[PDB]
């Protein structure tokens, strides 16, 4: 019955995933007919869009607009639509992550140094990724995901959430660096491409709009859980908590006419970011020069790195989202989700568009947005395809709705990203055990890993996971940032080999439990 059981039949996992979820397909339309779904669509849209605008911007900077915002928005939309319809876990938000950006920047620098075309280089990586994922899904390689315990899951989940929060603050700090609090400013600053010098009030208003949006979001989260107003209205206001926080703080910025704040910019229409470099279809054999056969074969090694990058990112996100603690009854498919996400990425490369992955924060945020809460415990989860479908479509239609987005500050969305980052820590026993380091040992909750485990041994087990978070944080920073997925895999040996030397069996079963 379990998803991560090795069947024996070639593509046995893929079919057993399709046989499981597609029976509840009519449910996946009708379960979306609630207002909490509509609220989630508006929330996850901005969570989905702004990274595509940002990473797209960076891609445009890093690769001389050979790939950019236009290409990433279109990829995010088409893969998002297809995955929402055909996927095993529609709650996964498919998009572009940092580790994928680090590879594009790395692969561009390679392609430059060796004097071989970059965008056609990615097509061949794409073909290898299609070859690998079919081979992996054929022999049910996603069974190995079962060995990835809560230990590795939470270290990953917690790290990703911390980095999200860090980068959200790094974005705010940057505004203060570009628009410092000076005594005097140049009243003449060209604003066509970007502010050409520091401006008054921009940095502090950015802080106020971020702080304000985060505050309101967290108060309407608290109001939802409170016992104020009629229950019907209390949920309607509460579920539309984030959309309401955005609307009012967007309106607050709109009425402030004189002060400048950075808004969401999108391309004018649907065209490639550099028309002189490429078209909509990338030629394998080459665009200008002859693409060499040495790299056509050698592209396997980059593709094997990209596979490991998408796989762990996506399969650990599928583990976190489809865990027994949450009320996911429809069922998850680790084989069909891997096949589409990695498969589409390969075909996306053929059109010069970026391959994507089930991103951890956006997926958790989207799942957490569709969870109805009782009392505190989770009653059920609104598992349906329409949230993801409509989000993916809106990202597609973001170019058409420029007049709407052009009056939405980034500062506002930075408040929502902070809310996303904080909220993502909720269902993580690592973060729970980190707060127990500060609580005295007579205020710890009545849980399995407190009653029949010694408090100093609990804290040692927590301490070892911090040392793993610390080591993983140093890697992502250093030039060995694409080696972080391999460092995270090394936490499986740590749990399976080393921890049972210092700890006993009973302690590890209670600390690292599959279901609690």
Ligand X SMILES: *[C@@H]1O[C@H](CO)[C@@H](O[C@@H]2O[C@H](CO)[C@@H](O)[C@H](O)[C@H]2NC(C)=O)[C@H](O)[C@H]1NC(C)=O
Ligand Y SMILES: CCCCCCCCCCCCCCCCCC(=O)OC[C@H](COP(=O)([O-])OCC[N+](C)(C)C)OC(=O)CCCCCCCCCCCCCCCCC
| Partner that binds at residue 274, options ligand CLR, ligand X, a second copy, none, CB closer than 5 to 8 Å by kind | ligand X
Strand ranges for 393-484 from DSSP E = none
Given 3-state DSSP classes, what are the helix, strand and coil percentages for the chain, each rounded to the nearest 5? 65, 5, 35
For a second copy, the binding residue among 11, 24, 185, 431 (CB under 8 A) is 185
Tokens read off for 130: 């299609």
Contact between 276 and ligand X (CB under 6 A)? yes
**214-247 b/e with 16+ CB inside 10 Å = b?**
bebbbebbeebeeeeeeeeebbeebbbbbbbbbe
Residue appearing with tokens 């869009």: 49
Q: Which residue's CB is nearer to ligand Y, number 207 or number 513? A: 207
By rule CB under 6 A, what string of x and - marks binding of each residue 164-183 to ligand 4DS? Answer: x--x---x------------
Chain positions contacting ligand Y, by CB under 6 A: 172-173, 176-177, 180-181, 207-208, 210-212, 214-215, 218, 252, 256, 418, 422
516/323 Cα distance (integer angstroms): 10
For ligand 4DS, the binding residue among 98, 243, 343, 345 (CB under 6 A) is 98
8 Å CB contact between 224 and 241: yes
105/456 Cα distance (integer angstroms): 44
Residue appearing with tokens 């004018």: 268
For ligand CLR, the binding residue among 147, 166, 228, 270 (CB under 6 A) is 270
Contact between 163 and ligand 4DS (CB under 6 A)? yes
User: Minimal distance in Å, beta carbon 413 to ligand 4DS?
Assistant: 8
User: Minimal distance in Å, beta carbon 415 to ligand Y?
Assistant: 7
User: Minimal distance in Å, beta carbon 474 to a second copy?
Assistant: 29
- SS3 (DSSP) at 353: coil
Nearby residues of 467 by Cβ (< 8 Å), 6 or more positions away? none
**Interior angle at CA 239, CA 233 and CA 241, nearest 5:** 100
Q: Which residue's CB is nearer to ligand X, number 71 or number 512? A: 71
Interacting stretch for a second copy, rule CB under 8 A, among 110-118, 179-187, 269-277, 303-311?
A: 179-187
For a second copy, the binding residue among 74, 208, 312, 399 (CB under 8 A) is 208
367/382 Cα distance (integer angstroms): 8
DSSP state of 495: I
Restricted to residues 79-98, the positions that interact with ligand CLR (CB under 6 A) are 81
Restricted to residues 37-56, the positions that interact with ligand 4DS (CB under 6 A) are 50-51, 54
176/327 Cα distance (integer angstroms): 43
Name the strand (E) or helix (H) holding 371: strand 371-373
User: Minimal distance in Å, beta carbon 374 to ligand 4DS?
Assistant: 31
For ligand CLR, the binding residue among 49, 77, 199, 209 (CB under 6 A) is 77
198/184 Cα distance (integer angstroms): 10
Read off φ and ψ for residue 94, nearest 5 degrees.
Answer: -85, 125
- SS3 (DSSP) at 493: helix
Contact between 252 and ligand CLR (CB under 6 A)? no
DSSP state of 482: G
**Binding residue count for ligand X, defined by CB under 6 A:** 5
Restricted to residues 235-254, the positions that interact with a second copy (CB under 8 A) are none
Contact between 374 and a second copy (CB under 8 A)? no
391/47 Cα distance (integer angstroms): 10
For ligand 4DS, the binding residue among 70, 97, 332, 387 (CB under 6 A) is 97
Contact between 152 and ligand X (CB under 6 A)? no
User: Minimal distance in Å, beta carbon 196 to a second copy?
Assistant: 15
Contact between 102 and ligand 4DS (CB under 6 A)? yes
Cα-Cα-Cα-Cα dihedral of 485, 79, 342, 424, to 10°? 30
**Interior angle at CA 367, CA 18 and CA 308, nearest 5:** 65
Contact between 182 and a second copy (CB under 8 A)? yes
For a second copy, the binding residue among 115, 193, 403, 440 (CB under 8 A) is 440
Contact between 200 and a second copy (CB under 8 A)? yes
- SS3 (DSSP) at 373: strand
User: Minimal distance in Å, beta carbon 176 to ligand Y?
Assistant: 3
245: closest CA among 35, 53, 427, 418? 418
| Binding region for ligand X (CB under 6 A) | 64-65, 274, 276-277
| Binding region for ligand CLR (CB under 6 A) | 11, 14-15, 35, 42, 74, 77-78, 81, 130, 133-134, 236, 240, 243-244, 246-247, 250, 270, 280, 339, 343, 393, 396-397, 404, 408, 437, 455-456, 459-460, 463, 466-467, 470
């Amino acid at each position: 019955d379990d998803p991560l059981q090795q069947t024996g039949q070639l593509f046995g996992g893929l079919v057993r995933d399709i046989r499981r979820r597609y029976p509840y397909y009519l449910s996946d339309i009708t379960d979306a007919f609630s207002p909490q779904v509509l609220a989630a669509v508006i929330f996850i849209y901005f969570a989905a869009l702004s990274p595509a605008i940002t990473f797209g911007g960076l891609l445009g900077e890093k690769t001389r607009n050979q790939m950019g915002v236009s290409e990433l928005l279109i990829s995010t939309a088409v893969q998002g639509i297809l995955f929402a319809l055909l996927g095993a876990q529609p709650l996964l938000v498919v998009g572009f992550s940092g580790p994928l950006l680090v590879f594009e920047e790395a692969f561009f620098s390679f392609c430059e140094t060796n004097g071989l075309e970059y965008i056609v280089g990615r097509v061949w990586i794409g073909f290898w990724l299609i070859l690998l994922v079919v081979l992996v899904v054929a022999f049910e390689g996603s069974f190995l995901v079962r060995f990835i315990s809560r230990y590795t899951q939470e270290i990953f989940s917690f790290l990703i959430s911390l980095i999200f929060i860090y980068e959200t603050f790094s974005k705010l700090i940057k505004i203060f660096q570009d628009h410092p609090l000076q005594k005097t400013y140049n009243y003449n600053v060209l604003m066509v491409p970007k502010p050409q010098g520091p401006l008054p009030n921009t940095a502090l208003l950015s802080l106020v709009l971020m702080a304000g949006t985060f505050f309101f979001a967290m108060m309407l989260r608290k109001f939802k859980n409170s016992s104020y107003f009629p229950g019907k209205l209390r949920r309607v206001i509460g579920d539309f908590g984030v959309p309401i926080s955005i609307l009012i703080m967007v309106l607050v910025d709109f009425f402030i006419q004189d002060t400048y704040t950075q808004k969401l910019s999108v391309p004018d229409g649907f065209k490639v970011s550099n028309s002189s470099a490429r078209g909509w279809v990338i030629h394998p054999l080459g665009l200008r020069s002859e693409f060499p056969i040495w790299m056509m074969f050698a592209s396997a090694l980059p593709a094997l790195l990209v596979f490991i990058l998408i796989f762990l990112e996506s399969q650990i996100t599928t583990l976190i989202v489809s865990k027994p603690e949450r009320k996911m009854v429809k069922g998850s498919g680790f084989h069909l989700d891997l096949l589409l996400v990695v498969g589409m990425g390969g075909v996306a490369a053929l059109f010069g568009m970026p391959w994507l992955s089930a991103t951890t924060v956006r997926s958790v945020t989207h799942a957490n947005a569709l969870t109805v809460m009782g009392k505190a415990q989770i009653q059920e989860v609104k598992e349906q395809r329409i949230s993801g479908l409509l989000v993916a479509v809106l990202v597609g239609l973001s170019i058409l709705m420029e007049p709407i987005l052009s009056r939405i500050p980034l500062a506002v969305l930075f408040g929502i990203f902070l809310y996303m980052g904080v909220t993502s820590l909720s269902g993580i026993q690592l973060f729970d055990r980190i707060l127990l380091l500060f609580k005295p040992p007579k205020y710890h909750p009545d849980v399995p890993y407190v009653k029949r485990v010694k408090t100093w041994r609990m804290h040692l087990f927590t301490g070892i996971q911090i040392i793993c978070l610390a080591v993983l944080w140093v890697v992502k920073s250093t030039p060995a940032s694409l080696a972080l997925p391999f460092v995270l895999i090394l936490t499986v040996p740590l749990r399976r080999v080393l921890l049972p030397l210092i700890f006993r069996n009973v302690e590890l079963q209670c600390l690292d439990a599959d279901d609690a």
